[PDB]
């Protein structure tokens, strides 16, 4: 700790005075993952392997829930041409469990693929399909020079809008009978919403036994963090999933697969200081632990 | 077997078209340099801006 004072003050000499050095943090013991009791695999083949996409004029959205389906098959095997993710990343997708997943499905030409982006202008974005400005998800414009191509027609509107109708006339009924620059492709969009409801679709990470009353790093549906898990007299409402405090700190989370009341108290942290008498006189050092019961060192 | 041969065959797509990547890893000026630009060296000047 004398050497700590020599380290912090950036000098080989120290004098009379307590010097703040660092913070005494108790390291986590072993990682714990508690995903819900669900173990089925969701049919992502009923969106990606589904190749009869729905034209952007009236596209199809698939709702999926209640599983721990893996993203590894889509992440590793890059059987696509464009993998642009806003929010999540292709590698970290396996760590988080999501409240709900909607897989938008439509087609668009080889050009104007950049119009599938938050705010990016263009006729397709102006009338057909407009992603919200605060979009969060992955866009996969996987190659369809042989699947897309007639029936796949195409033509301001709200984010995630949907309105199919027909009215010197004027009608937007346009098709495309293709058979590479002008060639249409297949575009699938995954729209995630996080931390809004009980997470239902999780990752492949195997569940791990829960631990209590110990500083342990945890992962509850994706709530990555480190802390000690204790019991509290507070009762979660049956509709409720997980609590929070000011500064968006999730102090209380009802642990899934057990539905038990828990409080994420932060691990034992205490301001470690030094009471040194100065290298001129002595070298014996005294250490302070700011506001910790002696029991915890 | 931990290793395979793709082959990078000739008349195929960009996936099978080999791009012979050469990676030039440089380093900041922190040591004597044995490689230098083709700049024409001149003399030095002392006690002058």
């Amino acid at each position: 700790p004398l050497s700590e004072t020599k380290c912090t003050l950036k000098s080989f000499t120290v004098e009379k005075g307590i010097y703040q050095t660092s913070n005494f943090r108790v390291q986590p013991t072993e990682s714990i993952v508690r995903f819900p009791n669900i173990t089925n695999l969701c049919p992502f083949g009923e969106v990606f392997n589904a190749t009869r996409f729905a034209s952007v004029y009236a596209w199809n959205r698939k709702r999926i829930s209640n599983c721990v389906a893996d993203y590894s098959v889509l992440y590793n095997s890059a059987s696509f041409s464009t993998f642009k993710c806003y929010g999540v990343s292709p590698t970290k997708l396996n760590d988080l469990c999501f409240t709900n997943v909607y897989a938008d499905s439509f087609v668009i030409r080889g050009d104007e693929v950049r119009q599938i982006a938050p705010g990016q202008t263009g006729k397709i974005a102006d009338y057909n399909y407009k992603l919200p400005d605060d979009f969060t998800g992955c866009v996969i414009a996987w190659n369809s020079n042989n699947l897309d191509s007639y029936n796949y027609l195409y033509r301001n509107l709200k984010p995630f809008e949907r309105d199919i109708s027909t009215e010197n006339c004027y009608f937007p009924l346009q098709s495309y009978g293709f058979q590479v620059g002008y060639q249409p492709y297949r575009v699938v969009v995954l729209s995630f919403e996080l931390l809004h409801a009980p997470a239902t679709v999780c990752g492949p990470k195997k569940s791990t036994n829960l631990v209590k009353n110990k500083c342990v790093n945890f992962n509850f549906n994706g709530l990555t963090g480190t802390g000690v898990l204790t019991e509290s007299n507070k009762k979660f409402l049956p509709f409720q999933q997980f609590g929070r405090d000011i500064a968006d700190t999730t102090d209380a989370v009802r642990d899934p697969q057990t539905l038990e009341i828990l409080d994420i108290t932060p691990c034992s942290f205490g301001g470690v200081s030094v009471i040194t008498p100065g290298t001129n006189t002595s070298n014996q050092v005294a250490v302070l632990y700011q506001d910790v019961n002696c029991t915890e060192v | 077997f931990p290793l395979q041969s793709y082959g990078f065959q000739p008349t195929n797509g960009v996936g099978y078209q080999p791009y012979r990547v050469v990676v030039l890893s440089f380093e900041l000026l922190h040591a004597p340099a044995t490689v230098c630009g083709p700049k024409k060296s001149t003399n030095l000047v002392k006690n002058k801006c």
Partner: antibody
Amino acid sequence: EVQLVQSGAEVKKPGESLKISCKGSGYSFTSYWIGWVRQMPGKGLEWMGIIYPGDSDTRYSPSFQGQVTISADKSISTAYLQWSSLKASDTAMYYCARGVAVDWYFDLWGRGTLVTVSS
Amino acid sequence: VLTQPPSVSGAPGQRVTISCTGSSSNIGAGYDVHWYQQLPGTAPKLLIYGNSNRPSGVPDRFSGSKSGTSASLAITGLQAEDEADYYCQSYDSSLSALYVFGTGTKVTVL
């Protein structure tokens, strides 16, 4: 002829590795799908796999994936069908036929090969 | 996986129909249903594509249609040459398989 042709009568023995070839000629193979079809004698036919010689994109049937290997030799317009361990119960009629997209059907068929493998 | 009437027998000069029955996810999903003629011992030939389009050179006696969960082949005026195997088609997205094949139909004329 405008067809997906193969070799003549084939008689072999189990345990040997055989890669039969299907040749494409007489059309613009770049814009169309080209694939194969299996058909057991006296039982319903099953498309095994299909490839797109435009960019050589490979697709197989769930029942017939991995057991066989194909390749679209688009430089010579050839479709392969690779067997590593031919089975005695593999006797059937194999059709290499090229299909279409959007509508997703077959419009032209090959004559097929009488593949009979027995001990 | 796409059930068909296994065998059809009929006199020459008869109007017969083949039921391309499926499920709500393969045939009744609204996707296109296509058809062929599989002459016994020879290569199959296309009969109906798109449920309304007709190939070049086909006789008009054969026509195709779809009715909800099942599809129907219109055979008008059977003749003695029509002794052949007939099989279904459709397209399935979610099933991964770009083509799906029917069980099969025998159509025989004496």
